[PDB]
Ligand SMILES: [Zn+2]
């Protein structure tokens with residue numbers, strides 16, 4: 001049936017990707033809100049700390065996570081580090 005507003009509450013599902021709450025407070029480009037989320041499944045393969053938003057659960061941003069590969073040069077600032 002159609003996926004809208006069914007009466008099947010008290011239900012949970014498991015996903016392949018693992019989303020965890022990091023520390024560094026990042027601001028989504030679309031949501032533009034204070035959030036600190038990072039996918040462990042991606043952090044490994046990509047080998048880098050990825051930033052996500054809690055809204056990912058139900059938002060267009062969710063797509064960005066899937067099409068992460070599709071990325072280009074946006075910022076033009078020199079990289080940096082801390083305590084490295
Ligand atoms: Zn977002």
Ligand SMILES: [Zn+2]
Nearest residue numbers: 017039041042
């Ligand atoms: Zn992921």
